[PDB]
From a paper:
The RBR/dAb3 complex yielded three-dimensional crystals under two different conditions (see the STAR Methods), one of which contained only dAb3. Apo dAb3 crystallized as a dimer and its structure, which was solved by molecular replacement, revealed that the dimer interface is similar to the interface between VH and VK of a conventional antibody. To investigate if the oligomeric states seen in the crystal structures also occur in solution, apo dAb3, HOIP RBR and the HOIP RBR/dAb3 complexes were evaluated by SEC-MALLS. Of the ten dAbs selected, dAb3 readily produced crystals in the apo and RBR-bound form. Interestingly, the dAb is dimeric in the apo form and bound to HOIP, with dimerization occurring via an interface similar to that observed between VH and VK domains of a conventional antibody, highlighting that synthetic dAbs based on human scaffolds may act as monomers or dimers.
Author numbering:
A (entry chain A): 1 to 120
B (entry chain B): 1 to 119
The structure:
Amino acid sequence: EVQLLESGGGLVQPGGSLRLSCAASGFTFRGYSMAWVRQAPGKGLEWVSTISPIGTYTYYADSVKGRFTISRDNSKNTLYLQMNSLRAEDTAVYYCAKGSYSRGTPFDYWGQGTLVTVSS
Amino acid sequence: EVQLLESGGGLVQPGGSLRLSCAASGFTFRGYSMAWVRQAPGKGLEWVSTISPIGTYTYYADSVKGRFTISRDNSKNTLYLQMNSLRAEDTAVYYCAKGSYSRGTPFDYWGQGTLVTVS
């Protein structure tokens, strides 16, 4: 019943822009921190950004500061990642992540992934 | 250098049992928590269970607590998931995932997945 539905990936040249979206079902956004993580080809998962439940606080990996913006719309149950000044090294599958209050993990649900290709 | 390979998936009758395993390479296995996550048809990834480095602590999603048991054998770099009383809701690709101590990533690698269908 819990679902995180991603969209927005695509193919761009360096300097391009994309907006990822993550629509949620089966829980209400307001209660939870949300995050974006990404897996670059042949690498391990890397954290991108986290946003607090009401959006008061946002956090960014050093590699995306000033270029990416996380935001959320709690009445829409949707999480966003605005990606500007895209770099080849941003090429990755991007996942949204639902914050959790369980002691077994700080995030207990992830989207299905959307591919971001920055090339040429 | 991290690599994870799940085994044991298959077709299971409703109410049946199945044991999955996960073999790991490229890291000191006993140094990390490990987890199972699963992807049902049409959905994203759902956290299933976590086990601590030596197995002292285990944690479960509410919908599998009790009928699932996570365990590990650190000398063989292997993680296990015993699944009992399986139901249609459990149909999914099951992945094992390596824990991480890095900011914002509780897990940093996960495996190829093994498919379990309950019907």
